[PDB]
Amino acid sequence: QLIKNGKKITAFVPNDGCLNFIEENDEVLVAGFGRKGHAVGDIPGVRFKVVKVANVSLLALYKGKKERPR
Amino acid sequence: ELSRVDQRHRASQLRKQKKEAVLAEKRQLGGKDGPPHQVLVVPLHSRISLPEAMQLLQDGTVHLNELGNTQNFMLLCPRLKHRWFFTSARPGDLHVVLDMAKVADTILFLLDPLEGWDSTGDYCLSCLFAQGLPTYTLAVQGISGLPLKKQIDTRKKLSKAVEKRFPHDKLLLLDTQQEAGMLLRQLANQKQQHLAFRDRRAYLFAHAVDFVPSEENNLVGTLKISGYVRGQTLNVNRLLHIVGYGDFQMKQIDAPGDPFPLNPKVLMKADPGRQESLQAEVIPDPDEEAEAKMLEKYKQERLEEMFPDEVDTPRDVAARIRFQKYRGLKSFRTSPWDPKENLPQDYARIFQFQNFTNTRKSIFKEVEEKEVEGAEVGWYVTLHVSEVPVSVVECFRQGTPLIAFSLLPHEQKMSVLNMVVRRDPGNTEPVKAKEELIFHCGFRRFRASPLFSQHTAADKHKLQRFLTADMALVATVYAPITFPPASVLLFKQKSNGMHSLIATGHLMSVDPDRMVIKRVVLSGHPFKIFTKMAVVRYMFFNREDVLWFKPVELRTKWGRRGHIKEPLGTHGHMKCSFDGKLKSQDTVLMNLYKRVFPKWTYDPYVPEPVPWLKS
RNA sequence: UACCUGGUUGAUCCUGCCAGUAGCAUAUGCUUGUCUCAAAGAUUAAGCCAUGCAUGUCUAAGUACGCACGGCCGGUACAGUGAAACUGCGAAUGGCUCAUUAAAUCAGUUAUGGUUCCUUUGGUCGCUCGCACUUGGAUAACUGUGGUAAUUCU
């Protein structure tokens, strides 16, 4: 759920084994997926992807470089 | 929406609404009606002496409280209209930092100018991130202890050393009293992080604690926990938990005069007998040998990572006896398993919820949307406790603080907690499945024997016999029931009482219905191959062994799936059908599943940790 | 450098869009040794503001009776420097933001023969046929008595 208007949005967690980093009710930085409003690839009707969790990037957590606070 | 005035006026309405929400939030702390603002100070690096910054920060009207070891004081200023309570902690001593950093309102970290922080402070900060940050505020000390030439580059080097742990923060320095004025101004106005695990119960910090022994020989008496209520409206009927000494019943609340008002004896409640929460945790009606064992654990983990659960069938013990309570499954995901099929006497000793989510919603709405007749927040109250050991007061004289929080309904009973948890990369010691590990599960501290499982979405969860360094597991154990969310920490005695951190996470839903399945795969080398037919040896050793495990379907490391047709030899020689033809370098294997349950090893007492150090 | 490539079919030739390609701008990730330039709370909220500062001012040349000073030489009206106060000038320039605003603002073009103008610069300053070898009354500065919880109040 976005902060700025309150809308409900489905977002795709990018890499393998990264959904466990996302915990219930956390701050997530969400981007577009890359087709400018058009649903991308396999996922139907889901056009956004999570970039950061709790102000730590998922790329660092997946690569095991940084640690996720709470 | 049209009509530019209409869009503008709708935006102004929304602006008013969010400003009213923010203003309604920020008056809850540090004011005439608000309780004092508790600031906990940690000097991370070993070179920093906290008395130096502590006397730079103490000047405002001071009230120097004292303890056995730690020295915390009260600050009051009408200049900023702010009430402060500064409390100091030492890194490495994870007991004090952990049990009083979960009630502090803002944490101030001190950093040396030359290095980032100490390794012991690194351990402390890792644990503090893993259990929850109230509000961190970076600070340094030795910046003006150097000339300007190295000063600016020292700030550059510190900024380099911080971004790996704290993603981005300004480093606010402490050298003068005016700089302390800047810091106090900063800590007065911060974006306060609502740590909801504090807010959902009624937690209270103790400034005074008096023991009135009913009988001194019985070593138990009446306790006087007086301090500030910081959570919700605290009610007497709800039981009271002390973080290091368990949950128990409280008998009386009085409200005396506050010690430090911002602008300078009567009892509130006694507990009724019928409306009291009952203390019923269970149902009423019923040297080199250690190194060798560690190397054996290393070999077992190395065997149970390149091969999942390969167990060699013993040729001495009969196979259908040693796996008597195992069953076969065609497919792990789809084959049904009855959750109420085989239960021991241990699950006849816990408490089950018909619907956890409905109960959690009901309890949370009864806390939030309803008001109780207890004492409100910010009040300086006193609690008389009927039953308490003596030694806690002795601990109150040692240097550790006392924190008491009033629980939700149905939080004292025993249930089966499931903890989502992943391994900290700092430790690499192999931990077996049924080891005894210390859980810090959100104001609670206890040894337990958990069971590790996968964190998937399905019903059955395969038991993990070791802790994986990247996979996020579920630790399942009998434990006192706690309502999620909850920070969860895992420690182990390394040597001489040094609590080492292994893994951390959150508390998932609590239920005994989450079954854990232990698997055993039995290997066999196929020594004869026909087309879609195979004769395999060394899987069993008797003749009736194949007849007992007939309906279990064989699988194959190369992906073939089959089912056995006949036994041929008196020994373990076994005819098997297949979908296709096996390769010559292939092995067949059969899956056996049983239901496994956690051991009942729970005890609320925890030994005091020694200061942590690096090997 | 006036450029294209994959994707409908059993295969072809098309229409056709989707995707790739390069830029440029904001955000962000990961990494970062030297060195010279250099943008930077515009976007969302022309939302709210703790505290400090941002607008003052004297020459030989308006007014010195503050011993406030070293200091004349002594009845020497006023030696000098000069706090304060009156007086004169500035504070309408600058800075900031882009909310308003669609022939409005603004841009090139013309006009004031339809007007206002501190200052600066040059002109004009006994053209006037009707006590002056010096006019009057106050009021700050200072002395002294105060009020109010409080102000650059009096």
Add this chain to the structure above:
RNA sequence: UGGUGACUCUAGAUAACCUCGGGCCGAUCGCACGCCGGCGGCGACGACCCAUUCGAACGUCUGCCCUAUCAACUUUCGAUGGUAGUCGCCGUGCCUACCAUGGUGACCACGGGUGACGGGGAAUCAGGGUUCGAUUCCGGAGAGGGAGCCUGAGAAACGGCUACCACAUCCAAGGAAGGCAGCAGGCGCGCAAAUUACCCACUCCCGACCCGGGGAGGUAGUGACGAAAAAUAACAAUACAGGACUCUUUCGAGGCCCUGUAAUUGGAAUGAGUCCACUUUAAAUCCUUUAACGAGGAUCCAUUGGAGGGCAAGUCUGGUGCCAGCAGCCGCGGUAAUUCCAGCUCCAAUAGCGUAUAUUAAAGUUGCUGCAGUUAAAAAGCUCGUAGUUGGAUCUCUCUCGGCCGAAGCGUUUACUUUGAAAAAAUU
């Protein structure tokens, strides 16, 4: 008298008026002092007015984005004009009184919207164009919202005042005080943006002023917004591996041949750093200049994306096995996975490189240059018809006033072209 292209101009004459809330005609200071009791040089302040400069203020002609699911708008309460006035610094419906019934519109009036302050300009781009411009220069507007004022040459001023509205600070509860869309800083909002530093030395401005003041401005701090240069190694000998050349049937052997690879050997040369001294500067810092220490790669070690096609670089090895996942698109995974995940090797850019969004070129897929309409998306069912757009051929310089020339008309009027002078600097 003098002058404009044109006066109801300037100047002159006469009759008068000249406000008690009034118009000018020095009751001022300094500097040196001096000549036949009296006359005086230089400067400062002042002043009715004129002219000037700095402007301000109104007008003129032309030029704005999207919208018809905005086609009639305006005029009782001025809408368009006329006469007289009122106010105004003036010209005017600017306001009032009396008349007239006008004014604008398919050449899009009026109404809306705008994620609109306009321009100089920015990015792209063959040519045409498309998009942007909050933003340091110019012009405008506003200091929380509206309104009304004081003083002054200049303000409907807000680092001035008075009110109401909305917030909000100190109380002794009687009252008092506000305005960071100035500089730093905070909250809040957020995907999104720095120091509560130092100085008037530079640039200029203000004042009574060779002196004082200046968060204008300068200077450092944060700063991978973006931009320019540019290290992370060079040479030689060996030791192998190949490639050619010669001699050898070949295998093999040589070269004052070539090309690679070497935690191989040798020396030299250096900068990043730590540190002096100088210089820099308002005082510093930085850059630049010197002494001192400072380099063998097994580090003073380069990253970020990728290896199925598009699209450069592996049908290499192990793990997971249509699971997990990858993949912009096409697609892969169901066991020899060329695509997942690792290792090794390799590719691309390189102190930089990924992703997301907006916009541009590709897009001759918005078509003016320059698209399409039988069958792919598309021609109104048909004809009349107004505005609009478009439209056959045709026609080759002088008379008066002044010194061969200057003045005066030109010629039906325009479009078009060419020249000329005016057109802010920065940017280009």
Add this chain to the structure above:
RNA sequence: CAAGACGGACCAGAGCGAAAGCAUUUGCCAAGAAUGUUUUCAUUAAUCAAGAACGAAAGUCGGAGGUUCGAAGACGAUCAG
């Protein structure tokens, strides 16, 4: 005998009309293209936002008449359904 209907075969790769459309004889009505002209007017023209006539069948309002055919609606056959 009466009632309303429709005008086959002739009927064509023909004809006319702006298209929709138009087929029994006779008269009247006012049109209409092409052809022929050493006629007349002399640019009056092409296409058209606005606006306007016509517009098969079916349908909808008022009347008349209802032969045939016939939406709806009523029968009978046909079957594991």
Add this chain to the structure above:
RNA sequence: GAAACCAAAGUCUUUGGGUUCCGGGGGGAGUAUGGUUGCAAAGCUGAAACUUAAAGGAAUUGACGGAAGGGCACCACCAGG
């Protein structure tokens, strides 16, 4: 010209005779809403949210016919042994 085909669908990268209407991947959808005409049914004008990598146009073969013919063989048949 993509070709089927077309003396126009030609005189089109060697691109400019005048003018009108109209299309911009496929669905949602000629749908909702609004206006207007209509007794009514309806007509004219007419979106978006969301959704997909195709939808489509011409021509060329035939895997296969549950399409039909022939033709072959004492490892098939007739006459037989």
